[PDB]
Design a protein around this ligand. Structure first.
Ligand SMILES: Nc1ncnc2c1ncn2[C@@H]1O[C@H](CSCC[C@H](N)C(=O)O)[C@@H](O)[C@H]1O
Ligand SMILES: Nc1ncnc2c1ncn2[C@@H]1O[C@H](CSCC[C@H](N)C(=O)O)[C@@H](O)[C@H]1O
Ligand SMILES: CCCCCCC[C@H](O)CC(=O)O
Ligand SMILES: CCCCCCC[C@H](O)CC(=O)O
Lengths: 356, 357
């Protein structure tokens, strides 16, 4: 009965996450800095790094390598470092282990005393032993709600609650996000070693409380309506569609700490809210290729969002009809954005959290 | 890759088709539980690590893991973290594992609130866990799988088991691969275990007389494959290509790395037993006379464990519906053959307890 989002499209995520990779780039610096100074476990005990919301692992390679290189300047070369990559049970962990084995950038190919493991359990519960994680990393994951909130009204535009006209929808989604954030922090608070550090990068609202991706939103809503207009999509199926993604404002991120600055042994050591450079727009300004612009934006939306949309269909998710819906939606969104390229706001928040 | 590897179990059916395996490993659980009573445990915030080498879907791991956890909780505080590290090949269905751990009431996650689960998708013929971190190792029905079809090995004329091959060169090539694999497995477990740690192994064996067993199954499988060629469902070139890289080890093969002084890479054999598991499908048939059920049980067993590796030899994709068709028909053919003449079979196993210095 509890409706959850779908994981990323395993087949395309590694090729369609350049936006995410570019946006998280500043957080890597914070993560490296944290690795330079974090208190370390005693003796030859393995140093554990956790990666919360790994997907295919492609975008984890750079942050993990940065942390590992920093740690190696502090510990013996034979000392074990274990990376625990976490996601939901239905994530494609085979794609992860293939990434870790095949990609030359994989830390397994650069450090002979680094190890990899996977945890397929929602990070809104405790999923690692208490007091074991020296360094935590989570990028582009916590914006995903644990669920479509119980009793929340159907989203008439489907793809983002920030653009909904229903006040009841916004408040339900907002409450779910606050609970999820409290849960995330409580359990990371137990998992981290005393003195441990967790770096979080997530979708944010900007200074003016805006979600961003305005033209994407428009293109996506219109592309969905076109499929019901062309009879390719059923009105009942479209009505069911909702993306459980919530961007948080600065005050939303500070909410669990506000009492006096601490929550379950954790404190915000650093917080930044910024707009990521729109690389797809920048490239378009350089080469003038409109189709490429549309395809890059559409690919980003497909790998991250379309499986969650596809789950609302009457057929199975491994049905030929679902594949056709995915490919058509992508093509339509590509066409709409290519026909009038516009820059987009990509509001992010980076946090460094410390355990006392 | 020119290195040809076996295929993992059929995720869709393994948990329903692994009762033979579960019944066979039962005696090894006693050994595992006993080891759990005394193995050294790591200090400080480190969790106790139990490693499960060759997890598949996780269905058969639940009982052995719980036995160890229960034993550990008689020694240490309830709030001490225990981490179970389930290991398999990268192409194993780890989603099916995590669903098993979440959904099966027998899961240790449902019986012990300070137990944790992780997965490692890297061949256990390399070191896959940090040195000295594993207190307790478990591996059931996994080590009989070769790391590869040996390079330059002749084609197996009967396809499903080298022990039944009439080709001297093929038997030698497979035996050598099995021997180096065993050395590798031991070398890396010897690194992963803490000093004083224990590893319990359960694998396919040759019996007292050097026999592989499953003779009626072997006959049914060979005949069924030939039937698929004869009936135009399988190409001769596809069948020629089929080989199951499974090797059963004799007592002497298992002891080989350790002879004559008893130690290899810091490990020793503390206990070894060679035995034939009770044939439960035969026992059931003797009780109820249901020949169809007999055939289906045996065929499902063969299907979940062996058929993905056979299907890998087909000209179509393994995601192609024709592969699914091949799987289904081979199972029905084997089921019918055995149903028509039910016979008891030998299921030769070896259980080992290995100890690190
Ligand atoms: N409750 C939860 N527990 C664990 N993972 C979750 C989750 N909710 C969403 N995710 C995962 O978060 C990921 C978002 S994609 C982000 C991937 C990568 N960190 C990057 O920066 O590109 C998906 O794999 C999704 O399955
Ligand atoms: N080199 C290797 N590394 C890790 N796992 C392997 C392997 N070769 C085979 N396996 C795994 O061994 C398993 C055999 S099935 C045994 C499952 C379970 N332990 C039980 O007792 O029923 C399969 O999942 C297979 O993928
Ligand atoms: C307006 C719709 C744009 C939403 C874009 C959503 C981006 C995803 O969160 C990225 C991810 O999960 O890796
Ligand atoms: C005659 C061939 C019968 C072989 C039966 C092989 C059984 C598999 O090893 C079981 C498994 O991998 O779990």
């Amino acid at each position: 009965v509890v409706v959850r989002p779908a994981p990323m499209e395993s087949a395309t995520y590694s090729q369609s996450s350049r936006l995410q990779a570019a946006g998280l780039s500043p957080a890597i610096t914070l993560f490296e800095k944290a690795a330079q100074t974090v208190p370390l476990p005693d003796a030859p005990q393995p140093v554990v790094i956790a990666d919360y919301g790994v997907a295919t692992g492609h975008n984890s390679l750079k942050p993990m390598m940065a942390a590992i290189n920093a740690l190696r300047r502090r510990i013996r070369e034979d000392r074990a470092i274990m990376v625990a990559h976490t996601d939901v049970p239905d994530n494609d962990f085979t794609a992860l282990f293939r990434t870790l084995a095949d990609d030359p950038d994989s830390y397994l190919h650069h450090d002979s005393a680094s190890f990899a493991s996977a945890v397929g359990r929602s990070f809104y519960t405790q999923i690692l032993p208490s007091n074991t994680v020296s360094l935590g990393w989570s990028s582009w994951a916590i914006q995903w709600l644990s669920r479509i909130p119980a009793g929340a009204p159907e989203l008439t535009d489907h793809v983002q609650v920030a653009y909904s006209k229903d006040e009841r929808a916004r408040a339900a989604y907002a409450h779910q996000a606050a609970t999820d954030w409290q849960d995330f922090l409580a359990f990371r608070g137990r998992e981290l070693c005393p003195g441990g550090r967790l770096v979080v990068l997530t979708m944010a609202l900007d200074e003016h409380g805006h979600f961003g991706y305005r033209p994407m939103n428009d293109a996506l809503v219109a592309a969905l309506n076109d499929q019901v207009r062309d009879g390719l999509l059923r009105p009942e199926e479209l009505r069911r569609m909702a993306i459980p993604v919530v961007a948080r404002a600065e005050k939303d991120l500070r909410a669990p700490f506000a009492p006096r600055g601490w929550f379950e042994g954790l404190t915000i050591e650093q917080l930044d809210v910024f707009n990521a450079e729109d690389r797809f727009w920048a490239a378009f300004q350089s080469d003038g290729d409109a189709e490429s612009f549309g395809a890059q934006w559409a690919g980003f939306a497909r790998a991250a969002l379309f499986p969650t949309l596809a789950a609302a269909l009457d057929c199975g998710t491994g049905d030929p009809r679902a594949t056709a819906f995915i490919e058509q939606l992508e093509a339509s969104v590509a066409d709409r954005l290519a026909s009038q390229p516009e820059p987009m706001r990509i509001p992010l928040a980076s946090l460094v959290l410390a355990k006392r």
